[PDB]
Design a protein around this ligand. Structure first.
Ligand SMILES: CN1CCCN[C@@H](Cc2ccc(Cl)cc2)CC(=O)N[C@H]2CCc3ccccc3N(CC(=O)N[C@H](Cc3ccc(Cl)c(CCc4ccccc4)c3)CC1=O)C2=O
Lengths: 213, 213, 151
């Protein structure tokens, strides 16, 4: 399994610094040029930086010159991006991509890591039940920054789930997730949503109990 | 962006759609073009390398070509699963940088229309205890992915406090969206009739409730 | 020119070890970890070129009739024919250096050992002077290692 996994993304204040890390697995890392490519939410891909196998050739986009520093530790199968003097425009999902030696194609990409450049503070979400086949849900209210993850019954309920995108009110995100189950939300047959907000180390379970309406 | 692409592209199932990528002599004119497909909510993946080569797993329907400073991606037999953002990328000799195109959002129109399944949720008691009231309107299983959401409180159209999510793609090629109405707990108590109205394709689906549960 | 230096180091090292018949263990003082990897790839690729085109290399060596310093000086006019047609790729560059090694091997046996260094700088001369932009674009000796990586 040839993989790339980015880390270090999170909330940082304007003018601040952050270091992104990317771990390579299943290949000879020291024989590849590597790249950083970023994407502002709802916007296009923007190549950030490139570093050859022995770090002899390094390149940066003009938008990042003098502020970002790419480097790699071949002994630790790691690629880094030291970002300094961060501004609102640097808010994006940052991807790590392996470059093919013979064609320069970016054949392997990581899943990405979100960097939010804001003065707003880390806020944990408030999880509320959404009770009216029957559609149940939970409202994940007033968190910051993104992301949050929602599962149902610790991942054992995946059919019929709809996790909607978030909306941004003032400086707080709200999202909801719904689940359609058979016509019996029986006390023995429970429906629980599992909400995680890694930025605030929140791990909340919320059992959805209906009322006669 | 240095490489230009039409912001959007569309076709019907089975049609042949073409996405162009326009560059200069120092990028497309000097180098090979690669294409990336970014499915909704996923990391980009290699689609085409060396102008027209397909990595293992990319179906025959995708083909690419290059002439002068332009490149093209051809998708024969358009399918709803081809709905994604397509990006071309080429190394630029005069910039010493990778240049990605602005991206093309591909929409597959003319599939069989589906009405939205609307579910309305009142605020939870737990949320009312914080002196806030959120009504959640879930909209799923609709095609095309364009909806209008209007809120009514006691027969009068709501003008403030509403937030609708942009439509998002489901696994079965249909769309989903979410709407929120935020009131104070006092305002929730002061009014009784709440309605979320969803308009799709000159046809509107309404779900309503009374606080008198 | 650090690239001229680094290429000269790798090429002169590869040609000297080829004439000797045995590979060294001592470090490279200019090239670095980039040079180590570059020389290692050149040893694997270059030897796989020298074997796969052994008859053609034997024939070219016979036809060239190299026996003195004047012949070694004129070998630069033969080296450019690897780029004469306007074609530049790592496949041509490795062949240019692999044959350089074959000639160096011949120069040692015909006891013209002192002419190996002149030859190594001549190969480096044709490479770095006529193909600088392409080498730099291709990420020099790192790109060379990345291009031939198999996995
Ligand atoms: C004027 N021309 C020809 C006009 C140029 N057009 C070429 C284009 C080309 C060039 C290279 C390659 Cl790999 C593939 C294609 C056609 C060609 O040469 N095809 C090749 C096909 C097979 C072959 C494979 C490997 C090596 C040689 C081959 N040989 C045998 C040969 O004798 N080739 C010479 C040219 C040549 C080619 C490669 C090398 Cl390394 C050298 C030696 C330089 C040197 C290096 C170190 C020390 C001293 C000298 C010379 C013909 C000539 O004199 C061919 O003929």
């Amino acid at each position: 399994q040839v993989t790339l996994k980015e880390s270090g993304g999170g909330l940082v204040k304007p003018g601040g610094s952050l270091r992104l890390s990317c771990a390579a697995s299943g290949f000879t890392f020291s024989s590849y040029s590597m790249n950083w490519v970023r994407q502002a939410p709802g916007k296009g891909l923007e190549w950030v930086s490139s570093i050859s196998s022995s770090s002899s050739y390094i390149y940066y986009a003009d938008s990042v010159k003098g502020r970002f520093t790419i480097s790699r530790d071949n002994a630790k199968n790691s690629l880094y991006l030291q970002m300094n003097s961060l501004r609102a425009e640097d808010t994006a999902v940052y991807y790590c991509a392996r470059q093919v030696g013979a064609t320069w194609a970016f054949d392997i990409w990581g899943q990405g890591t979100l960097v939010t450049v804001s003065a707003a503070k880390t806020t944990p979400p408030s999880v509320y039940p959404l009770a009216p086949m029957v559609t149940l849900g939970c409202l994940v209210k007033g968190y910051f920054p993104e992301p949050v993850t929602v599962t149902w019954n610790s991942g054992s309920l995946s059919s019929g789930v709809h996790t909607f995108p978030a909306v941004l009110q003032s400086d707080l995100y709200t999202l909801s997730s719904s689940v359609t189950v058979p016509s019996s939300p029986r006390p023995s047959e429970t429906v629980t949503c599992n909400v995680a907000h890694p930025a605030s180390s929140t791990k909340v379970d919320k059992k959805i109990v209906p009322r006669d309406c | 962006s240095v490489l230009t692409q039409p912001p959007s592209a569309s076709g019907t199932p089975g049609q042949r759609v073409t996405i162009s990528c326009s560059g200069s002599s120092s990028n497309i004119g000097s180098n090979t073009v690669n294409w990336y497909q970014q499915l909704p909510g996923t990391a980009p993946k290699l689609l085409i390398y060396s102008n027209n080569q397909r990595p293992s797993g990319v179906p025959d329907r995708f083909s690419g070509s290059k002439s002068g400073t332009s490149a093209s991606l051809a998708i024969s037999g358009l399918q709803s699963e081809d709905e994604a953002d397509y990006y071309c990328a080429a190394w630029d000799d005069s910039l010493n940088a990778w240049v990605f195109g602005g991206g093309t959002k591909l929409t597959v129109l003319g599939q069989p229309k589906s009405s939205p399944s609307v579910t309305l949720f009142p605020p939870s008691s737990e949320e009312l205890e914080t002196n806030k009231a959120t009504l959640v309107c879930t909209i799923t299983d609709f095609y095309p992915g364009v909806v209008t959401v209007d809120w009514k409180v006691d027969g009068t159209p709501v003008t403030q406090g509403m937030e609708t999510t942009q439509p998002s793609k489901q696994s079965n090629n249909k769309y989903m969206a979410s709407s929120y109405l935020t009131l104070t707990a006092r305002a929730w108590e002061r009014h009784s009739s709440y309605s979320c109205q969803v308009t799709h394709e000159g046809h509107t689906v309404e779900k309503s409730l009374s606080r008198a549960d | 020119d650090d690239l001229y230096r680094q290429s000269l180091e790798i090429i002169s090292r590869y040609l000297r070890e080829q004439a000797t018949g045995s590979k060294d263990s001592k470090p490279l003082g200019e090239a670095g970890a980039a040079g180590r990897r570059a020389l290692e790839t050149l040893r694997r690729v270059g030897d796989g070129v020298q074997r796969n085109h052994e008859t053609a290399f034997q024939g070219m060596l016979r036809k060239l009739d190299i026996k003195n310093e004047d012949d070694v000086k004129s070998l630069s006019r033969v080296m450019i024919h690897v780029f004469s047609d306007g074609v530049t790729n790592w496949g041509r560059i490795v062949t240019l250096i692999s044959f350089g090694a074959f000639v160096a091997k011949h120069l040692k046996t015909i006891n013209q050992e002192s002419c190996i260094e002149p030859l190594a700088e001549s190969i480096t001369d044709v490479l770095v002077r006529t193909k600088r932009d392409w080498l730099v674009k291709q990420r020099g000796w790192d790109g060379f290692v990345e291009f031939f990586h198999v996995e």
